[PDB]
Every structure is written in structure tokens, then in C-alpha cells.
């Protein structure tokens, strides 16, 4: 079978890459779109591993209808785990 | 970095194996949970590449609350997630 924990880590990896690129890049329009998609789908805002960048993402209107922390309760890494572990 | 394609393939494949386990394996508790979690989250039911079993999983109440299963392809929902439309 497909390796569970490796796929969950790849998706976090991928999300992190988008989240960073959303703020640091010369407007990666897709990176911003992707990052909204995740937040809405997972009811989510940022990462605990990227709490500096998550702040500015929050204020750029890429999170579900909340202000700063909060944030530590809105970790996407944890919602990604829960998706692959059959919770929610 | 990680490529969008290979990760989007992996996740479909992970789901597909959950969809199968939920039906063919008897006790498969986690497989059912995983399957419903995906359906609830992504808003979809089953897969085009598993249309027969999807019939069963719809009928086991593991989907959101039959003719229109083709419109609820849950593989597409996964692509939309990683591409950024959803």
C-alpha cells in the first residue's frame, strides 16, 4: 500500500511551499489561490512552523471569515494529519 | 520544491486504496473513516476509476447528504485542491 505518513508529510511540504511563495514571491497568483483553497477546504489559517509568514497571510485576506492568535489553534499541518487519519 | 503532479497522484492513490478497503475488507474502520473524511471535506462521492465500488459506498452512507455520481468525481476535487480552484 501507499505510505500514509509520507503522503501527509508531502502535502504539508507542498502547502508550506505555497504559503511561503504567496508572500515572498513576485505575486505567484496561483500560490495565493492554492493557499486560499486549502484554508477554506480545511477550515484553516497558516502553519505553526511558519507563524511569521502566517500573520501577513491572515491580513491579506486568505483565511476563513478571526484575527492573529487564534492562529495557533488554526494550524493546517494538524488538519492535514486529520484528513489522512479519518477524523474531522 | 515538491512537484504538484506526483503529490496529487499519491493522494488519489491513497484515497483509492481507502475506497477499496472500506468495501472489500470487513472490519476496515479507519478506511471508512478516511473515506468519509475525504468525502465530507472535498465534497464528493467515490471515483470514476472505481465506479462500481462507489455505488456500494454511496449506499453505505459514507458520502455527503446515484445517477449523478459521475458529477461528484472525487478525483477531480483532489486536482482542484492542488491547482487552486475549489
Amino acid at each position: 500500500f501507499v505510505n500514509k505518513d509520507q503522503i501527509a508529510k508531502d502535502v504539508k511540504q507542498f502547502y508550506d511551499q505555497a504559503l511561503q511563495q504567496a508572500v515572498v514571491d513576485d505575486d505567484a497568483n496561483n500560490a495565493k489561490a492554492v493557499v486560499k483553497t486549502f484554508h477554506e477546504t480545511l477550515d484553516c489559517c497558516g502553519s505553526s512552523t511558519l507563524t511569521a509568514l502566517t500573520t501577513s497571510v491572515l491580513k491579506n485576506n486568505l483565511c476563513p471569515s478571526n484575527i492573529i492568535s487564534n492562529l495557533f489553534k488554526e494550524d493546517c499541518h494538524q488538519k492535514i494529519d486529520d484528513l489522512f487519519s479519518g477524523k474531522h | 520544491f515538491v512537484n504538484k503532479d506526483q503529490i496529487a497522484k499519491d493522494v488519489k492513490q491513497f484515497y483509492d486504496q481507502a475506497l477499496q478497503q472500506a468495501v472489500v475488507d470487513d472490519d476496515a474502520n479507519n478506511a471508512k473513516a478516511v473515506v468519509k473524511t475525504f468525502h465530507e471535506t472535498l465534497d464528493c462521492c467515490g471515483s470514476s476509476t472505481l465506479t462500481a465500488l462507489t455505488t456500494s459506498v454511496l449506499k453505505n452512507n459514507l458520502c455527503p447528504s446515484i445517477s449523478n455520481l459521475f458529477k461528484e468525481d472525487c478525483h477531480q476535487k483532489i486536482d482542484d485542491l492542488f491547482s487552486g480552484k475549489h
Partner: antibody
Amino acid sequence: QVQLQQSGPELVKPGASVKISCKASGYTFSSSWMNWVKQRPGKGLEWIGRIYSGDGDAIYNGKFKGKATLTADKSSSTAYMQLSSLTSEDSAVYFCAREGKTGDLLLRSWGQGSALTVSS
Amino acid sequence: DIVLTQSPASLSVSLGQRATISCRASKSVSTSIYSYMHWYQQKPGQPPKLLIKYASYLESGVPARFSGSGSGTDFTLNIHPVEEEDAATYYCEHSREFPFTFGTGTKLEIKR
């Protein structure tokens, strides 16, 4: 003990209809699928379709789509199968078989069959 | 539709001996984790009985002398050692997609 007792043999005139029946016991009919398979004398097995007893939703083999008609009856715990415009080569034994508790997609318990023979 | 070509059409096998039937699918019947091919036995005048499920798994209450193997399009069924009660027609069936279809059929004769 799971058993599926089927309707007796039947002689019917060409161009008529027959409603064969398959009564289920010893398992929860209401949330189970029931399949139907055709077998002509001295020949193989042909799958007709399967119906979900909980709400009568049925998936037909394209070959039997407009001819076969599956229906479920929870109270009786009975699946029915109806064939229109009967022809000499609808003569055959017709089986019913249940799937597992999930939708196994596998024919786990079979009735004895029903000998339908079409002749004027 | 998936076309199941069983072979041989029939075979005669002495008691105590091995009998191998094969089934070949027109396209693949396997996913990453499951081969959706099953074997049925039909004694005349009776309904068929499921013997092997998902290529290799013994349906409960079936002698271990029945075994199955294969993947993709190529599937084999082995009975060993053959017995009198194994006189029947053997059918392979896929459940990969709609419509379900059955194999051409293989008739086992028991040499005594």
C-alpha cells in the same frame, strides 16, 4: 442460516411478462444488494443487474436495460425481477444472489434458480 | 465489456491429481492492491458457489486444496488433490466494473 428461496418454474406465452421472485432470510435484506444472473440450457452465466434493497436503486447490464426490471420489497424481504416482451430465448433458469454486508460486489449466496420457458 | 476467456474448455483429471484452469481478461482487472477476479464452481442442477475471491483468497469453508493466483489479465485456478466432489463447471468472474461478466466456462471431468 442464509437462504434465498425463489419462485417455482414458469411457462409463459411469447410477448408476455413474468415476475420472478427471490425471498431472502437470515440476513439483513433491507441494506443489502441483490443480483440477478441468467443461464441458458448448456450455456454460461450472464449478469443482468443488481438492486439496492434500501431504496430500489438498480444498475442494469446494458443488454438487459430496457427489458429487465428489478424491484425490492423490504416488508417481504423479497427481490423481484420482471421481463417484458418474452421470447423463446428468454427461456432459461434465472438466479438471484446477494452480496456481502458492504457492497462486496461478489455473489455470496444463490437461490435454486427459476426455470422460465417461453412457448405458445 | 471485459471478456473472460477461460481455458481449457474442459479437462479430465485422475483422482488425487492436480487440475489447473486459467482465465484471461480482455483488459486489466487489478488495481494497486486488489485483483477483482473470482472463481465459481457449478455442479449441474445447482447454483454456482464462490470458491476463490480476489484472485487468491479462500472463501470460508472451502478446502485449502483449492487455490488461486494471478494479476492484471492472467489468472489461474488450481485444484490439488482432485476429488470426486470436484466434478463441476468452473467459472471465473470479474467485479472491476459494470457490467460484471463471466468466463467461457471449464468443465472438470474426474478420471477414476
